[PDB]
């Protein structure tokens, strides 16, 4: 009963990415780890507690990825087709689950939620980053509204795909990504 | 009641179309949708009785008032570019709507997708009539062969503009997209007078 909120943080992540976030329950989440009525209400009294702490863990999960799209990548145009290419990484989950950061800011944005501000920093870290690697990669002038536009094309393919059941599209969509992504950089 | 209990159903199913987008599908409970025709617990149900039976005619309003909202694209149009213009505009008009509420299109099937919901292939045919239409129009343009693929790219930056304008709460971001996306019509349409 110590480090293990961090335990149900993460099953509650799973759940909600999953699941959607207003659908799951104490129910689901306590049963994912393993607990009681008693042994869970100890660590939580409210859902809206328990997102507050995934959007936070989410946030890491973004960032700490981000990163080691920072390392692997060698290059500009490298460290921002690890983005790109995300898509292709998961294309089952997305296809199904749609988006994580997407779908839970749309799911907070239609409920009213008082944290979309908090689950749409997800959204502001993959755009701050985007527009670092467009400055290192050669529109350090444009970096800004590339950065909102690629985000944007991403949530379209990755919304009609989970809608369409098309993981094909996913495919189509990431090609005209990559070619648009063509002439628009400069040589390096 | 007669002839009439037809338009005591539409009554309900009128009042919920409306709150489904702009509350979520799931949300919007019995009781709110009985506070909004203000009937008795008693004709609600003789109409209705899950909220899936209320989704299921909330659908086909929704792809009665598509189609004949396509049909103003077409009528008021003379021009494939005319008549596809009509799909990016959308997004200006309902900038408002849009911004806080969503695409009333995509945010219905997420949430029936996110909830493994059974309407959605339903709620999907909504998309289907954007898809086939814009195709349709991509070919009188003189771009039949990419028909199909051009429809379902121009549908997926909408949703992208809408996704992210909503989350973003930025009208200024969907007025970016859609001026972008008439750029992008324009510089893909082989031209015509």
């Known amino acids: 009963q110590a480090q293990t909120r961090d335990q149900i943080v993460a099953a509650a992540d799973e759940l909600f990415y999953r699941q959607g976030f207003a659908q799951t329950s104490f129910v689901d989440i306590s049963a994912a780890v393993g607990i009681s009525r008693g042994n869970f209400y100890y660590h939580f009294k409210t859902k809206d507690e328990i997102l507050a702490e995934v959007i936070r863990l989410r946030l ?27 898509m292709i990484m998961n294309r ?19 409920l009213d939620h008082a944290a979309q501000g908090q689950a749409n ?16 990669a050669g ?12 985000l944007a094309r991403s949530q379209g393919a ?8 098309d993981e094909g599209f996913l495919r189509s969509e ?15």
């Not at 839970?104 to 944005?109: A, D, G, I, V």
């Not at 529109?139 to 690629?150: N, S, V």
């Not at 990431?174 to 390096?188: C, E, K, Q, S, Y």
């Open 60 to 86: 890491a999960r973004t960032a700490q990825m981000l990163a080691d799209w920072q390392g692997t990548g060698d290059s500009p145009r490298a460290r921002i087709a690890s983005f790109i290419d995300l």
């Open 92 to 110: 089952a989950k997305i296809t199904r689950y749609g988006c994580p950061v997407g779908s839970l800011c749309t799911e907070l944005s239609k």
């Open 121 to 136: 920093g997800l959204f502001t870290l993959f755009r701050d980053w985007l527009q670092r690697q467009f400055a290192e």
């Open 139 to 150: 529109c350090t002038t444009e970096a800004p509204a590339l950065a909102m536009h690629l």
């Open 158 to 165: 990755a919304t009609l795909a989970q809608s369409f059941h």
């Open 174 to 188: 990431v090609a005209d990504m990559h070619r648009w992504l063509d002439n628009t950089l400069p040589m390096t």
